[model samples]
Target: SKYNFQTAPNRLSHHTYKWKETETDPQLLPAWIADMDFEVMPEVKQAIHDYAEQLVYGYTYASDELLQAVLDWEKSEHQYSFDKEDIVFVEGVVPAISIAIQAFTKEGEAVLINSPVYPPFARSVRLNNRKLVSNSLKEENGLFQIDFEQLENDIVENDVKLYLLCNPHNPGGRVWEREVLEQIGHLCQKHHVILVSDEIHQDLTLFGHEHVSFNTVSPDFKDFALVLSSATKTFNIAGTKNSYAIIENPTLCAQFKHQQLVNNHHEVSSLGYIATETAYRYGKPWLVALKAVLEENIQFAVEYFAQEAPRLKVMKPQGTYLIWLDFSDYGLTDDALFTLLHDQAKVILNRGSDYGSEGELHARLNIAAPKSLVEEICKRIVCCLPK
Candidate 1:
């Protein structure tokens, strides 16, 4: 690989949230958050540095150049295209999700999401005073499959007004197939429910998997669906806080932007724009190398657990660097499992219950760190848990 990913970035020197959680206990390893442990491409860093050298930090709007970069990147990567008018910039995907929830659905209306999804999906719905209807995804052959019948049932029974979908789903890391996306689109169209697809992890799909954009399922989908994504996740520049929504419907776009302005959230940080545009345009080479490293790490973690801790089952990820671990064989409660890992193994992992009830007895592990760190993490987990 041209880029060196063998060594983890020194995140302690910066204000990193993931590393800070375990700073007090040096022995504790954190593999909880979705944040990567690698440095971004040099192009991104150089762009941000150059912008800072200007010495005049003032208010700025999303430029045509930035929008073009986003459009070209999407077309080049996913074969999906949209116009500049469809793009609406927001600080981040989560905030964009909240704004969408407010703009599209009213209080007391139901919003649908898959269970054991990213915590924020459920949080955003309920936080906005909307009823959250969870349709549990089924696991078959060690992969997540959407229960279409059940999904429609939930939408019908709950009178769902909007549906939040995580393409290349977060915890489970499944790159949804094109057929499944079409089914979801048809269902949403039939129910007249608005669809908000979070494709933040679209660029992170691995192991020969392809990401299918929700809006690309059919032309009709664009009428009622929007996509939220950013280059931040791909380049490990998430702190830049620049994400955009691709809405093809002029009416929906107008309403969303109006709500955005009403909420006083209409600007992206200056450096955020620089980093995002630079990364999307010139960061593909580094991304290729990073994916290679993550593939190795994923394979290593799975085999290491098989040999060292046979009872701990790893749901090998097809997309994101996160691996869902099933610890049901141990028969330990959530708190018990957490305490055992924290106190004995000295490792920090996101609790499965935090995602939803369907995630109980499961844990999410981030494998985007150095391979050496992953080995040590496995050793500690294997040494602590019963074989």
Candidate 2:
């Protein structure tokens, strides 16, 4: 069925962080949050409706049917094959990270992550009481790439026990090439660092980039990798709360399960399965439509910045709906830049510094809204700026 992405949904956030965060202002257009400004897939919504009609929202469990749905999704969508036994259900990827950090590493043991990454990456470690080590990325010609040598060195030097990685990386939207994944896997294996890949954006690849599942790089990739992902991000069903970890190595699998049981976090979301299974099984048409909508919004924003606000450089993403923009040329302090958007333009944006110091003077703009909203957002920014 044809989907609608042109119409903007009425999100009366009221006081949600996406809308206000800490803003004193009440009438701001929010373009900062990661979730899309669109509705869920009809099939996914139908799944939930069916569940609700059954009137049995009792204790539920994921069955072999759910497992098969996921397996089919993995094989048919991404061309990655794995057994049903490889999957483990969890709440959300954030909690998944917390679990991985607490279960896999010890106190004060260093955990490495790419700088300018998703904020929760660092928070998960800090909350878990692990040392955070950052390997800042290198940018050339407006694209971001991992500094591999620095990454391994950070791992070895800091005695890093685990490395958290993002592919189709968040904030920057640079999808790691297969070669990059291979090199990372080899390095982690060599250093005996457990690699936990946060791949919640795996299904959201935009432009022409193909996401390389961290464990799909090689036979041994899964040996050192604990892959985490879900249908929440792509389907915009984050509040539904479902994520899964693909631990291919039996030893790591057993260890994760042991830790999960110890922590008493083995329950799965009853509605989460309904939504995700429906998404993976029948959400492709919706996903394709979403990609088209996002690409249109993103391309328009880039062109508008280039033509209207020449000082601001909007980075064209390879995938993902978020646009990482450079305001460094404007020479505004982070506070000034943020205030210019939030206070003057009345547009809420994710501060670059929230990602890392490397993201200073940068802000992330989400372009998954209707074209009119995106155009207005650009116009607002242009109006507020010293153009």
Candidate 3:
């Protein structure tokens, strides 16, 4: 492959968050966070490098050309449409989510999120004083799927004011079908809830899976939804902290803009602009190859769990590189599982509990690393098994 999937850049000296933190054993393999150890495209790197050479690195703002680059990528790559005027650039997707929560919701109002999702979704709601309502995704034949009937009921029952959705869902790794988005749109429209979608993983779908941009479902869809996404996750430039939100409804759009003015000051780093535009404009082949490697990692993990640790249910994701491992059948408490992986097996993975109470017996393992490294972690797990 043109992209390097066989080796991870050394992070020990550079102080990367994923592995350099003291919370993890230095010698252990870190496969916990959404971060990737893979190198970004050479084209993107060069763009940033060339910009740094300018030495005019003062306070900066997003440029129209850069916005056009992002818009083109959204249209060409994922079949999502947005005019240049509809873009809202922010430093990160999480902040965008926080802004939307504050703008569209109020104290004590209910905000609905699918359970066992990204931890920040729950935290943002609580921090902002919104009533947190989790409509848990049910696992059917090893697939984690949305419960639409329960979804409609939750919005109506709680009188929810906002709904946070994950497009290519995190942790569980579902690239939800378009029909699912339409169903969600129907429910949200009927209940008059403003939907905020985090689609940061839309570009990371594995082979045979397609990401449905929530707004692309229909004209009515965008009226009640704002989709937040970035090239950061897909292009491995998360450290640059650039993300964009698409708001089709003028009233919601003005509300979001006003919130940003009050809290965020509304401008991103210039280097982020340069790097993101470069990645989107020139990162397609790089993205294609990266997806292939992610799929390979998933396949490798599925077979490993099936043969070496059959009790652990390994879900083959339709999208993201994160794998949900069901260890309920492993005959061990969550505490015992953690100790084995951290202290004994010496492998680092995110405890399912971190996501929600519903994730108690599960663990989310990220497979977006060197294939060799992930294989080593698997070997460590299999070797440490009770023999």
Candidate 4:
């Protein structure tokens, strides 16, 4: 039988958690959060059910099984191999990024990021009392490219100690190639900057694109990089709150582990471990099907916008279900853009300005749910466009 990607089940209700708060009116569609609306894969569901049936919920330690599962999945799926000893479980990638900042650099030090990044990258830098420096990604020939010369200047001028790297970058969805990764690694190493790579979306590449781990490129890169990843993003298990910071350098690993203890964030729930392991080990089929659906959804949205919402252009995404649409032609202010989406379309999409000033005239639409739902939202969005 052919895989029916369009008919996949959604695990999340339209009204739940933050969605409930954002979608107060019954007419509004909540498409803002990064969470997927798909059902947990059958294999993952069975694992959760089996664990619950055990009926003993207690504090859990990191298991060799969980570690091995991660190792095996990375090696097999991503072509990146690492030993179990390199993995350090954390609550989530955001926390891992924050902790890495605290562990590796001092307060008041400078940290750099490519602009139009995940909003939290900036927040974490500031929250940790560090200076946040951004080198905006350049839009070239229909794709975002790194302004390496600008980045190098920022690193040197700001005395940037850490570089927050996003693999399949959020919003933009540009998957860094092997050569790009190698060049980035060399640049960081030369600048004496630590590369904290948020690779949570590494497994979600579409159109057969490869997601290369920064550390996998070279020994020097490995020593200078800490890869932050989790099954949470891939399997819609963020609330499960399980993630890992893969630290290859022994001294660096020890330092990060110690920081977690000091910050009182070292605890990992039993459910987090079991769910992550189950998803990584057995969720491949579901992921493959989901990606197929998302790719179709992306194509549909791009065409729909081009014909109907000509003022808004949907950038093609290389990975992730999130599409970043350029709305600069409309000449709408960030506040005005968001207001229109919230009030007229009644759809809650991420405001591009939240990512950075560079994201100002842009908005992010998430297509990680059923195709019908994605179409409905897109239709409403076009209807709200100014003639």
Candidate 5:
């Protein structure tokens, strides 16, 4: 690959203070957050620079160029056509998830989600006073499969009003096939449940696996699904805070827009608009190079764990830069495994318990940065394990 994707350039020694400062002698490598360590692509950086030099950081709205960037990317990459009027910008994916839950769902109503999902999916549902109906993914023969029967049963049994989906599913990293998405769409429609498809990590698929956007699977999917996406995860511009909700159905778009207006959350930053446009429009080449590097890193981690860290089996990641490692063989509690990673290995990773109880013995390792960091983190983990 032309890009050097094996280095952690944005090493965070400062953020370590939260966990390290009181520990007296803390050797830390903070990799818990989903943010990448790579520098922004040249075009994205330039766009940010251009915006900063303007010095007109007053109240700004999303421009047509920004909307077109998303539309063009969707059409070119996923073959999904989106209109400018269908798009609404938001600060980040998590916030968008929160807003979507608030807009389309009601308190005490049921929200459906897959377990070992992103923590925020659970949190957002609960924080909004909604009943969370977890349809746990089945781990059979080392692969995770959605329990569709359970999903259908839950929707009817719980009166579930919404389905919060993680396409290129977080923690598990299962890039759902088109057939699966279609089935889900049909189920949602039949049950009259709104589907919030969080495709934030859609762009980070590894080799041989193609990401099927939920809405792209079928035209009818539009009536049931709302896609939340951004260039932040793909291009490493998350801190600049740019993401949007893609609602193809006019009524759904109108409802979400109305919610935004009521909450006074319509303002977007100039840098966010410029960064997003430059990333989707010009960052494809860089993204392709980055994915190649990530695939190599993922393969390396799989092999290393199989040979050296046998007790910690890494589930083969189909998409996203995160590796879901099964530490069940160690027979350690979630807290014990978390402590081993943090205190013994001096490494930080997302504990599975944070996602759900099902993730208790699992750990989520982010491999988006340079391969060297990935190897170093893995080696440290192996070294820390008990013989």
Candidate 6:
């Protein structure tokens, strides 16, 4: 491989949130959060470096060129279409979600999200005083799938004004199919709920899976659809804090832009702009190779769990590097399972409970690291668990 997958850059000294917790205990392997251990594309790094060469790191705004870059990338890579004027720059996807909630919904109105999703989805709803309702995804044959009937019922019952969807879903890693998006679009359209899709992981699909952009389902669906995405997750430049929302509806786009103004988070960092545009323009090959390594790591871990930790059910994802492990059959409580991983195994995987009640018996393990590191993480977990 042109890029090294066998080894990764040492981020311990970089003051990253993922590795900072291991400061006191280097023995602990931090695989909880989504950021990768691999290096970003050299092209992206050079772009930021060259931009910083100009010492005037003053107030900056997202340029038309950057917005064009986003549009081109989406059209070429995803076959999705949205004009430059439709793009609204935000600090991060989470903030974009928060802005959507504030822009679209009133207090005490219901916001629907699938359970066992990214914690911030539910957190943002509660913090904004919107009623939070979950239509939990059901596992069928080791895959977590959306319950569309229940989804429609929840929207009707709660009179939901907003729905936050995780495309290529976090934790479980199910790539939302085109039909699924259409079904969701029909339901949202029927119930008059604005749908905000968190598609930060759209570019990270593994094993030949395709990501279906929600708005691409139907032209009319764009009336109530907002798609949030970024180059951060795919390019591993999350620290830059750059994300954008794509809205085809003029009225909805105006509402989101107004909210950004009210919140005074209307501009992206200068470096964020540089990195995002550069990555989208030149990060494709790097991403392709990265997906190969991720799939390898996922396969290794799945087989390890099957042979070494047989009781653990691996929800093998078709997208994203996250593996949702079902430990319900392991004959241990959630507390015991997590403690064993943290204290005994000396590895720090995300506790499933952090997501929602549906995530209780499941813990999320991120494998976007070097194969060597991933192998050791598997060994640590297998070795510490009772045989």
Minimal lDDT window, size 10, model 4: 1-10
lDDT of 5 by residue, 1-387 (tens): 455565555434545332443255546765566777676688876777787788767877777877888999988887878788888898888888877788898789999999989999999999999999999889976768888888899889999999999999998789889988888898988989999999999888777888898888887889878999999889887777889999988888888887777778776777778788889988989998888888888899899988997777778889988888888888687788888998989888888899988897888888776778788888888887865
How far off is residue 334 in model 1, in Å?
A: 0.7
Residue-by-residue lDDT tens digits, candidate 4, 125-165: 99889999998999987688998888888999999999999
Off by over 4 Å in 6: none
lDDT string, candidate 2, 44-112, tens digits: 778877988988678889988889988888788778789999999998888788888888899999999
lDDT tens digits by residue: candidate 3, 1-387 = 667878887777666678764344566788888889898899988997799799887887788888899889889987988788789998999999889999998899999999989999999999999999999999898788898889888888899999999988888888899888898898888889899989999998886888988998888888899989999889888888889998878899999999999995598888878888898888999888898888888899889878988767778898888888877776678888788887888888899988998789788888889889888977776666542
When sorted by lDDT, best at the front, the candidate numbers are 6, 1, 3, 4, 2, 5
- For each of the candidates, the C-alpha root-mean-square deviation to the true structure, in angstroms, is 1.1, 1.8, 1.5, 1.8, 2.1, 1.1
Which prediction has more favorable TM-score, 1 or 3? Answer: 1
Q: Which digits, one per residue and each the tens of the lDDT, describe model 1 over residues 45-65?
A: 788779989999998878899
TM-score of 5: 0.95
Q: Please, what is the TM-score per model?
A: 0.98, 0.96, 0.97, 0.96, 0.95, 0.98
lDDT digits (tens) for residues 164-250 of candidate 6: 999989978999889888999999888999999899999988887899988888989889998999999999999998999998899
CA lDDT of every candidate = 0.89, 0.85, 0.86, 0.86, 0.83, 0.90
**Lowest-lDDT window of 10 residues in candidate 5?**
14-23
TM-score of 6: 0.98
lDDT of 3: 0.86
Number of backbone collisions per candidate:
0, 1, 0, 1, 4, 0
